[PDB]
Design a protein around this ligand. Sequence first.
Ligand SMILES: NCCc1c[nH]c2ccc(O)cc12
Ligand SMILES: NCCc1c[nH]c2ccc(O)cc12
Lengths: 342, 367, 367, 365
Amino acid sequence: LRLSDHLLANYKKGVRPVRDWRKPTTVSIDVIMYAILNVDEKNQVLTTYIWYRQYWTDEFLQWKLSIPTDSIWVPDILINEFVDPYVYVHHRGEVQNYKPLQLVTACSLDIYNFPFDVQNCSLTFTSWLHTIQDINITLWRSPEEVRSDKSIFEWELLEVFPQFKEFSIDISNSYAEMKFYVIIRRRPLFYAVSLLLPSIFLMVVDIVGFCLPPDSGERVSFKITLLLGYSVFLIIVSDTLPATAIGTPLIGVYFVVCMALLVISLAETIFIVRLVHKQDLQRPVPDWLRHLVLDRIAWIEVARDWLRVGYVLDRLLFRIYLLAVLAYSITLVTLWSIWHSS
Amino acid sequence: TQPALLRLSDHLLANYKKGVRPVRDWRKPTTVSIDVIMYAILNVDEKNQVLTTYIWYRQYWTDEFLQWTPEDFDNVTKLSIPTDSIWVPDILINEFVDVGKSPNIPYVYVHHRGEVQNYKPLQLVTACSLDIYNFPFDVQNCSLTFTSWLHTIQDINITLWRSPEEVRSDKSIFINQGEWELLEVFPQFKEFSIDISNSYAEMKFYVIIRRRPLFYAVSLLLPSIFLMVVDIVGFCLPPDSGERVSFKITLLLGYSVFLIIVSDTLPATAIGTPLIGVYFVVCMALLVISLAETIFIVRLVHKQDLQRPVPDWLRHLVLDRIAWILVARDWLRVGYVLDRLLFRIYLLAVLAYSITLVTLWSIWHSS
Amino acid sequence: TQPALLRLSDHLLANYKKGVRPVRDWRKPTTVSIDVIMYAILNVDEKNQVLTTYIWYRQYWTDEFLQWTPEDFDNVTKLSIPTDSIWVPDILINEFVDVGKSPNIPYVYVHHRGEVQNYKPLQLVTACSLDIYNFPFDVQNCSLTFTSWLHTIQDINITLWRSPEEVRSDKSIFINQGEWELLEVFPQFKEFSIDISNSYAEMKFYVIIRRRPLFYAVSLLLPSIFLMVVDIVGFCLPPDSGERVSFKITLLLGYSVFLIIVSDTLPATAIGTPLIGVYFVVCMALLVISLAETIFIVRLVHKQDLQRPVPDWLRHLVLDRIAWILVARDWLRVGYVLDRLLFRIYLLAVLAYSITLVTLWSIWHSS
Amino acid sequence: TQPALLRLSDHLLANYKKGVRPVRDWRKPTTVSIDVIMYAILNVDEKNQVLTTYIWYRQYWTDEFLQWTPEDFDNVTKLSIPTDSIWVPDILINEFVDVGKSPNIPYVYVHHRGEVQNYKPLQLVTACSLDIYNFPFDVQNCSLTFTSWLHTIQDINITLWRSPEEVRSDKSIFINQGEWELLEVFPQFKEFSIDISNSYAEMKFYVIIRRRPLFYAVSLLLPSIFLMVVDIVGFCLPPDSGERVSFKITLLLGYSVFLIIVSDTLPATAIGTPLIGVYFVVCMALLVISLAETIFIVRLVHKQLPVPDWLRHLVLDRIAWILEVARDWLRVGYVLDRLLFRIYLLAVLAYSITLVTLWSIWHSS
Ligand SMILES: NCCc1c[nH]c2ccc(O)cc12
Ligand SMILES: NCCc1c[nH]c2ccc(O)cc12
């Protein structure tokens, strides 16, 4: 009890421990990651669980002692991109600080590879107000060699490595910047089942629908039901994939491409249904665009007028849709290869 | 005591009282200089109220009790002492709904002439006016006001550390990510007085903000126009006694899904739904009317039913409305002419929808 | 000489002991006038029955130790004593389930006669009843009980700064743009006694609020009405025709999705579900029953599976039904009477839904 | 002259020092009565294994240094002393995780015989083992232990202000319209000792909370059973080789939306998913299998190949006993579709049975 009274008398919080104020103090911090947490995909902020572990170098306190955090000085080393009591002090001249934190740090998020995304984010360390001409953050050891190889970890933590430069930080002329880039990976299984699994069947059922007779009215009902299916799947699209200034990911483009393609197919099918003997109306073609289109096809009552053109247009659209499906498959293969590479 | 930093700090904080305002004459109000630099507007979340933002905040007021003269002390020109030892003005936001989670930092700089610098980040959450009538092409005008919560004008006064024209166009450190882009910050100085004649000092920072609708356009708009163009052929291309019974209900369910999608991302507000939602409701009503028409004039009601006398004065109307616009046979003719009328109404509705989307885009771009 | 403020603050705070109730006679209670201004209703959580609201709170008590003659201290009649340096009473809301992220105001005005004014913004997370039987046309009242945690009437007595009418009809700074509209704030003071000699002062503010249902009406009421209307009008199709089968199938798919998201959207409390959830699940059951009727119809005529069996239950039940409403052929007649019965049931259900909506709106608008 | 309250407070705290046990004698201990009243169960995070409550915790210890004759201080028989100027028992919670944000009450009465009372609201966050295997019909049993911390009895003897019967039915102030229903608060007294030399004193405020399933009845159970019935009637209605693939994929999309809602509603634990997530996943798997088989059969029949004959013998012998070369393919597709329908009916029967069994266990409490 009386030990604290003696030590607290000859100590001031506001002053830096220095023999002379010209000499700059040295502060060391080692960042410990654990249990990576949810990342808000909106490209605004990500939340992670961290351990601080700050080590000091020189203090004018000499005589294990436990003291409240308000009885010893703690430097205001914080994070530049940052949003949202017992002290382990030794009599030899070293102090230890134990406190868990959540960064909830703002960063730049990449969605263009959803859901197989391996994005990079930074953890910059500095002091918000200190000029840091005397409290530089030169570290005790280099975390590059030791931290990178192994760590103690819906998201996967992959690699955290440091990087330093002298002059930086925009709040003031701050000498403290030891950036901690963070690499994370996402579990895609739930996202795969929720998005890719129902969508890929929406690519193969439409192929099956092309086997139906184009002139038959049953294909119209099939396309109507698939249009309702895309209407329903739009809810999944809106709920699952996030919003970003870059827009929808590379997967989201193919969804609207296939929806537009099926809309065009349905419109063509309905037009052919009208123009075949169901309604016909002896409607003639100008015979100019007809022969032009026939010449284009040449390289890779009222029956032949409409049935042939409808069939060839349906075959062309089926080829286009199969090409779109192949592009989708290639995109997923490439995304999975690049994500599993990391 | 050889470094004498302890001596300097204890000399400045010897007879200093934190609670007393630092003025030699009590009749002179203390003037606070405010600098606000935007960082992000992350997590706008619900659009009924609330606006989350991150700013970098500064304060510059002169303390007359910390005017220690140099050339006799350690010859320093800059001292840092904890914020818990000096008087700090009670500057607060009127819309200060949530304090948020921000690191409260000590050690405000104190100059050798007494000037105090109070750099501090603020993770603000404020309540402002959010008009979603033009969604997704939305531009919002939210206020970040700063005022003394309890001190009056003759106690605390508010000024700007830099001229307003510098504040408007100094979005330097702002990160240009997320769905929202900051356009303008407008500082204005309007006094505050609610009940009695104790004049307050209030400064308004009008944060003009803009939304990027690219994702929203791709996700919600382009499918909507696809359903419009499906309806346009659907009214005229499929004839009666066909698949129209399933067609109209399927597109009606699609429009209902569109209303659902608009609803989930847009919270309840004094305005019911944006203009796009109003047009979706109108198209749903038109589809209901078309379905009622088809069922009532085709199939079991009229096509299968026989010897049902249908008179009325509508045949007198079609002798004139068909000129203005341009029992089985009678039923087919009346169904066809009313279907053409519904075609014209829906074509007008789609034209109005496209025109209003163009108008909203023009307003959003010309902001 | 010393500044006027420093001398006055030293004179007031010398030999001043907080934690002692500032009265020169301990037998007279300290009257703490209370005034509350409602600023915003941040959130009304029916899940946890907690009301999140933001109010501007003012206190008013007389400290008999902080009295000074204005003739001295250079004619000063007001000060800024820190809050944590004097006696501040123990009034707090009994309904707290969370303190809230309310900023602290470290200053008060002490007048030259001892009158102390406390201004602070309170972010309240308080428990309520939150009956959702009338959703969306929902009117709810919440109490804000201000009483001292452990001070009786003989120690602390709570009154109103303003007259009850002024508190009731304030509507000054409230944000009239959210989901909830503030109807009134009803203050009334009742002495609360746990026993015969431990009466406690208590002030109750009744925050009566009213939801804005236009958004919910457009999002939920219009689609959920159009869908049942088209379901009614689709019974005009022949019961035995296969065109109704696809109609029923796709209507089932769309309406099932619609109800999935609706049931996700609707709130739920301990009492159960709103009055419209009953009609929604009733329509669920009715649509399932209609599809089962189609199942029975299709198997009769699509194949020869049901042609061989004959009705063993006879027409007695069917005869009673046709009296109440007013081999194949027999099965088709059974299908027709069941279809007519389901038509009556749908008509009754939709009529009841419309009457319920009208009654809910009339209750909501009247009060 | 001097105010009675001011003079009395000056006299009481002049010789008083915080940190020393108020009992003048060095032998007999300091009894500390306790009275805990539950107000609300704010949050139960099963993933983090933290129980967030809100109690009204009261202490009644008879201080000995705060004794005064009323006749000497203008008949003041009761005084309000700041809680930071006198000794207060250091009773903490053994299951402590976080203290939360609770209002600060800085006053405590002392009577003319030194009878201090300390009422305080606590937004406690405690760690208790939570099992969600019976969601939403789950009954939890979370402890609440108040310990002596520094003192090792014969200094502080924690006792109850009221008998366990009074504290058991503390529903006079509870907000009983939330998700969790407070069943009982049963206190248990037991002494634990680090060493045989001396023992500690503690209480065990067993708090049993039962979840109200009516919150999720319309959100999960009714939509789930509606989708089960819809899947059944969608197996029944369309022909197996007919125009069903479009309807089946629309149904699959709807049920995937339902699973999105479920994942946004159900809670997650390190133990695993509740008993209904298994049924949801099983129904998804069977629906996907049915859609894939129907797609395969329709593709083969529209291909126009007759039978592999490595399975026809077993299908006729075994698979057929569930109860034009493409015609045999259509028949075997129909047989497998009927088998899948029977499997789905068995699965929905199991789902219906387990819900009543879970409800009965929940109702048994
Ligand atoms: N910035 C608000 C200052 C203010 C002026 N009048 C008030 C009345 C109550 C209150 O809490 C605050 C105020
Ligand atoms: N002085 C008010 C004490 C108090 C607070 N909450 C209470 C609830 C019930 C009661 O009898 C008393 C109280």
